[PDB]
């Protein structure tokens, strides 16, 4: 059904649409947090051995 019934907005400009859509997403820092988590994980493994 999804394959047979796709539809776009009547007047779509892709660059404007995406500039509006993605902008809120890239204000987060969870990836920067996860990097610090991974560093500690590796430190713990080496300390254990």
């Amino acid at each position: 059904v999804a394959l047979l019934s796709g539809k776009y907005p009547p007047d779509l400009v892709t660059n404007v649409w995406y500039a509006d859509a993605i902008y809120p997403m890239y204000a987060d820092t969870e990836v920067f947090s996860n990097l610090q988590r991974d560093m500690i994980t590796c430190e713990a493994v080496q300390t254990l051995v």
Partner: protein
């Protein structure tokens, strides 16, 4: 004890232990009519209440001061209230009346108002005047009930005496607490006992026909009747819907505090928002899990397409983020002395961390506890408090921005700094687009618009009479007409042939009054307008319709809950979407000439030009007026019909309104008031309210906000928002929908900042915006949280009735309609089905009998209620509780249940001894005719199709006066030579081709007869009319019958086969409607089997009619039914052309439409109107389209059967078969199942022949 002895078999019959039977119904009616209220109270004494129902009662209830220091005489010699609590304490105070009560003969304990009081009142004594005002207002307050409370409480006792009920689905007994824990009944009994004291009569008051008789007890108080009404409502709701006794006790405590306060209504009004504030607007602050729906809004956003994705799991990131209301709840509770109640409510609310059935049911139970009564206050105070406000325009338009007058209006410059430019442009463009339309100039369209305002209701024609007598013109008296003169139909008959120049002065006439009380609200005032004012308002109306139909997301709906748009509310409430509720306070008062009327009237007057030059409208001719806007020269400009009409309306809009007030409750408070409040009784008010709402919201979103705020987040949010996509407005209510950004929900304080920005923008032009940002959605009196909707039980009182005058009640048969309406309301709100059905049966049995001295007793058999829609419980020895309340009403429902239990009925009749020797195709060898005859099934069935009010027709009137009335109406209607020519051509073509095919075809010439019949029927009836009505019911009851209607006989020749269950449409873990939780078994299964309707009903039903609109007095369903019957019977295209010409169409598109219809294919709903088949109102909340299209198979499952063959010509039978199958499957309980056609006894051709015979027969 007494209840058990009196009602022995009936309790078992309605509890599902034994079968239901007419004789048991009859002796139960005997008992119900033979009890007395003293018996009711002594029966109440029998119940052994428990300590849980115990509750302290404030002693202050029984001792109140006198009414003396509550009223005063103003300068203008009018009785007015003394406001002590605040500027709104203008309602009935709580004080004693025993001093002013006078003993009544043959009723020693009960007495009415002293007649000497109103003797001195008409004499002119101020004390007598205030005393009689207080007495009358107390009577009006106590009169706001449907019927005596003794009947309801006795019915409750009888219904509950059965006990616990076994659930056929859950296979277990219900565990609803018994009456020994019902707190409100105990309080009722205690307060009644204390009021009565040693005096033997125990009822506080007699609810007489057109009055009330109070008990002469020293402890009597005016708040007792409303307090008892609240108590009985709470008890019934608790025993029918499984309310929490704890919350019931809180509600009772609030009611007792209201009674102890100075003014009951004032106290309720000040504290009505406790439960919503402490339960709904504070929830899920610690959310942890659950399921919420996932919808999608499909373009066109205007067309309202919502298609359902699925369920979306909840998490902690979607917890409550709106600002708290803890503080405000605290000072409110402390100020009104409900701090413990508030604290308990918050503490109990805090203990929910998962959105689910328990939480939604808790919210519903909290909602139901609010007291519901129709508030009452005197019309004098109502008028003097509602019509004295005016807008506060902080920033007005500079005076150097308006040109010289044109006519009498002015033109607003294009360099104005005020924001009124955009409103001006919007109205101008809308008016121009409206004017540039060919349909606008269609004389039939003009006739429809002109006949719109004509109505059988009052229009303050008195002031019209004095005005026309002053200008000395003479109107026909219509002496000898047995119709009332207080109708707009009568007004039109009087002014049928009058020049517009003669009638022009009438637009500046005066206005009468109307009042309607409302539940938990101040009374609403309605301002009637007579013919001339209604007619002179057309252009503004039509422009407002154009605006609301082409430039916004406007909605229209009625009082019916089904007519609303559930998808919009659920989409707004479902996370991560958010909703903002906006309401304009005193919109009528805010709308004034200073800003709005000036701008809009000028805009419309200048926009309507060009397309209308020098040509009349609505029968108003064109004219010629003066122009001086242009500097230095002032010449004459010609104006059109709309332009002249707007020119005349403008002076009224600039001067204001005069209002006659005639307060019956207060002798001498009769006067006239000058006000600027916009009329409410007009035919556009809501329409331009919506127009201005949308226009001003767009103006704020596009201009004012971005140039008053600088916060980047706010700027981005407002740029994202747009009215055509995220705002829905109607009248004074509106909803803002904010979507979710990729990071989740939107920033709460950013939204809040937008809120105060909106308010600040509002004060400049003086609109009092009330904004709610609390996490829930409220629109059109509907509530939504997290996608689920909460039915508000408090808003629909069970024993509530609207009475706003001294008029009497109606004859006995009228009450049954209200009882059925109450049952249907219970169905819609969704109470416990078994208990609700049992109580409904008990109440109908209680009210089913009456006495008439002709000393005869007229009775309604149990089958009449089944026909009206009440389902059965157990009959013919069948299994109990096998019928759902979604059963259709009338022939469809009868066929449904009869076909469901058909084979067992034959065995039961044969066993009972009703044997015959004729192989009837339906019942075999059973004497069904005789059996039904003694069982009164035929008699009740046939008495079902009888009027429940006396017919005011048949009034004697001389032929001359009747013919002048009819010709006056016809002359008023036919103002157009082309219309007369079209109608005459249609009549000639009809008598040529279509003659005798249908007996009565709709025609435009028949409107005067309909108007005359309506005018005569709107009048009151008398004793002889009651006589004929009673004797007709008696004849129907005594007469014998041999069969049902031909329609039902044809229906019972169809056999189906229910084999396989359907497929789930919605997940069985999603709470979408509160109160329909798994505990309420059957409706839950029906809903999860069929699926909710995700489409607006109005737009869906729009494309089911060939013609969309017609003049008043003619019915579009009648028109298309006649056309379809003509096509089915086989009349030629000329007959359809003649019918279309007779209904006013132009010949060209008339013949084109006939040709299209002759071979065009319509849907099942449109087909079914030939046999008067309509979708039950209970199905309006479900998706019946899928059931019609893909789940009712018209082919036998095994293959092709010889009998089940539809002839090619008789293609319309498929719609009827689909409706029959759907009715059967919906009447059956449990999940929906796939139904397949099984057999037709005589084949399709015979059934079609019978149907055509029927269609050819009606019309006689």
């Amino acid at each position: 004890s007494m209840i058990l002895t009196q009602f022995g078999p009936f309790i078992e019959s309605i509890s599902g232990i034994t079968d239901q039977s007419n004789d048991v119904f009859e002796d139960a009616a005997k008992a119900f009519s033979m009890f007395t209220r003293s018996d009711v109270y002594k029966a109440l004494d029998e119940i052994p209440f428990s300590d849980d129902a115990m509750l302290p009662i404030p002693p202050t209830i029984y001792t109140k001061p006198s009414h003396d220091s509550y009223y005063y005489i103003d300068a203008l010699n009018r009785v007015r209230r003394k406001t002590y609590q605040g500027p709104d304490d203008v309602y009935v105070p709580n004080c004693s009346i025993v001093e002013l009560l006078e003993p009544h003969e043959t009723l020693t304990s009960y007495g009415r108002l002293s007649e000497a009081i109103e003797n001195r009142a008409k004499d002119g004594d101020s004390q007598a005047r205030i005393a009689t005002t207080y007495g009358r207002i107390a009577e009006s307050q106590a009169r706001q009930i449907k019927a005596p409370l003794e009947k309801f409480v006795l019915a409750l006792l009888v219904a509950e005496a059965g006990g616990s009920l076994y659930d056929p689905v859950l296979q277990k007994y219900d565990e609803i607490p018994d009456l020994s824990h019902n707190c409100p009944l105990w309080c009722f009994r205690e307060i009644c006992r204390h009021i009565s004291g040693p005096l033997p009569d125990r009822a506080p008051y007699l609810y007489l026909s057109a009055g009330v008789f109070w008990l002469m007890s020293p402890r009597m108080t005016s708040a007792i009747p409303p307090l008892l009404s609240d108590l009985v409502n709470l008890a019934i709701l608790q025993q029918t819907a499984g309310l929490d006794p704890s919350l019931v006790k809180l509600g009772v405590q609030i009611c007792l505090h209201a009674a102890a306060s100075s003014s009951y209504a004032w106290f309720i009004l000040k504290t009505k928002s406790i439960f919503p504030q402490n339960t709904l607007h504070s929830m899920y602050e610690s959310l942890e899990g659950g399921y919420c729906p996932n919808l999608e809004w499909l373009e066109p956003r205007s067309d309202y397409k919502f298609m359902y994705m699925g369920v979306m799991p909840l998490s902690a990131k979607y917890a409550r983020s709106a600002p708290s209301n803890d503080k405000k709840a605290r000072e409110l509770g402390e100020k009104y002395g409900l701090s413990s109640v508030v604290g308990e409510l918050r503490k109990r609310t805090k203990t929910y961390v998962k959105h689910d059935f328990a939480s939604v049911r808790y919210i519903r139970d909290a909602m139901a506890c609010t007291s519901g009564i129709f508030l009452v206050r005197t019309p004098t105070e109502t008028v003097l408090q509602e019509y004295t406000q005016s807008p506060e325009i902080k920033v007005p338009i500079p005076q150097k921005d308006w040109t010289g007058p044109i006519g009498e209006i002015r033109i607003l410059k294009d360099t104005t700094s005020s924001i009124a430019r955009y409103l001006y442009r919007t109205w101008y463009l809308a008016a121009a687009r409206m004017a540039a339309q060919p349909r606008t100039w269609d004389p039939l369209f003009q006739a429809i618009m002109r006949s719109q305002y004509v109505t059988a209701r009052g229009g303050s024609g008195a002031a019209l009479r004095e005005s026309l007598y002053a200008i000395n013109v003479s109107l026909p008296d219509f002496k000898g007409l047995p119709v009332k003169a207080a109708t707009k139909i009568f007004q039109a008959a009087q002014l049928a042939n009058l020049p517009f120049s003669h009638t022009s002065v009438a637009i500046l006439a005066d206005t009468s009054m109307g009042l309607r009380n409302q539940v938990q609200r101040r009374p609403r005032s309605i301002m009637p307008l007579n013919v001339p004012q209604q007619q002179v308002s057309a252009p503004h109306t039509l422009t407002a319709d154009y605006i609301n139909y082409h430039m916004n997301l406007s909605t229209t709906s009625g009082s019916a809950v089904i007519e609303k748009v559930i998808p919009l509310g659920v989409y707004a409430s479902s996370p991560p979407n958010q909703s903002i509720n906006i309401d304009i306070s005193a919109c009528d008062a805010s709308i004034t000439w200073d800003f709005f009327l000036s701008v809009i009237m000028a805009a419309i007057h200048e926009g309507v030009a060009s397309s209308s030059i020098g040509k009349p409208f609505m029968g108003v001719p064109a004219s010629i007026v003066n122009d001086e806007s242009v500097v230095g020269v002032r010449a004459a400009r010609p104006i059109s019909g709309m332009q002249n009409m707007i020119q005349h309306l403008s002076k009224l809009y600039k001067r204001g309104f005069s209002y006659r007030v005639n307060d019956s409750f207060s002798p001498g408070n009769d006067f006239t008031h000058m006000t600027t409040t916009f009329p409410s009784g007009s035919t556009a008010t809501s329409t331009e309210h919506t127009a201005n709402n949308s226009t001003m919201m767009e103006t704020f979103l596009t201009v004012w906000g971005p140039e008053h705020t600088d916060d980047p987040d706010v700027l981005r949010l407002m740029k994202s928002l747009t009215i055509q996509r995220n705002y829905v407005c109607q009248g004074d209510d509106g909803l803002m929908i904010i979507d979710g950004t990729t990071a989740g929900k939107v920033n709460s304080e950013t939204i809040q900042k937008m809120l105060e920005l909106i308010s600040k923008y509002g004060e400049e032009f003086g609109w009092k915006y009330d904004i709610a940002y609390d996490g829930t959605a409220e629109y059109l009196k509907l509530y939504f949280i997290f996608g689920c909707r909460i039915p508000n039980l408090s808003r629909h009182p069970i024993v509530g009735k609207e009475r706003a005058n001294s008029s009497a009640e109606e004859p006995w048969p009228a009450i049954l309609d209200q009882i059925m309406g109450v049952f249907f309301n219970g169905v819609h709100d969704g109470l416990q089905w078994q208990r609700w059905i049992r109580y409904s049966w008990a109440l109908c049995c209680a009210f089913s009998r009456q006495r008439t001295m002709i000393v005869g007793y007229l009775q309604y058999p149990m089958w009449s209620f089944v026909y009206w829609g009440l389902p059965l419980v157990k009959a013919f020895g069948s299994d109990p509780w096998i019928f759902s309340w979604y059963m259709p009403t009338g022939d469809l429902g009868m066929y449904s249940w009869i076909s469901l239990i058909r084979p067992l009925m034959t065995r039961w009749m044969v066993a009972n001894g009703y044997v015959t020797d004729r192989c009837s195709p339906v019942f075999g060898n059973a004497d069904y005719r005789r059996c039904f005859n003694e069982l009164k099934l035929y008699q009740g069935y046939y008495m079902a199709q009888l009027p429940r009010n006396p017919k005011k027709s048949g009034r004697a009137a001389p032929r001359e006066v009747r013919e002048q009335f009819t010709q006056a109406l016809s002359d008023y209607l036919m103002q157009n030579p082309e219309l007369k020519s079209r109608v005459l051509r249609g009549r000639s073509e009809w008598e040529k081709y279509g003659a005798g095919i249908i007996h009565n075809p709709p025609s435009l010439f028949d409107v005067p007869h309909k108007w005359y019949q309506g005018a005569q029927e709107a009048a009151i009836a008398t004793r002889e009319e009651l006589a004929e009505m009673d004797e007709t019911l008696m004849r129907a009851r005594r007469h014998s019958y041999s069969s049902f209607s031909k329609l039902l006989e044809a229906y019972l020749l169809v056999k189906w086969r229910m084999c396989e269950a359907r497929e789930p449409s919605v997940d069985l873990r999603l709470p979408l409607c509160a109160g329909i939780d798994p505990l309420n078994s059957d409706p839950f299964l029906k809903m999860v089997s069929v699926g909710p309707m995700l489409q607006s009903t109005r737009k869906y039903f729009a494309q089911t009619l060939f013609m969309a609109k017609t003049v008043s007095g003619l019915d579009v369903n009648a028109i298309d039914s006649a056309l379809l019957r003509l096509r089915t019977l086989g009349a030629d295209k000329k007959a359809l052309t003649a019918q279309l010409l007779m209904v006013g169409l132009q010949e060209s598109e008339a013949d084109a439409l006939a040709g299209k219809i002759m071979l065009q294919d319509v849907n099942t709903v449109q087909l079914a109107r030939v046999v008067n088949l309509a979708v039950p109102d209970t199905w309006m909340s479900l998706d019946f389209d899928s059931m019609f299209k893909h789940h009712v198979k018209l082919l036998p499952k095994d293959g092709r059967h010889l009998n089940t063959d539809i002839p090619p010509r008789m293609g319309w039978l498929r719609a009827i078969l689909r409706f029959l199958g759907a009715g059967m499957v919906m009447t059956a309980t449990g999940v929906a199942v796939d139904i397949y056609l099984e057999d037709i006894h005589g084949g399709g051709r015979s059934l079609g022949q019978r149907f055509m015979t029927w269609m050819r027969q009606e019309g006689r």
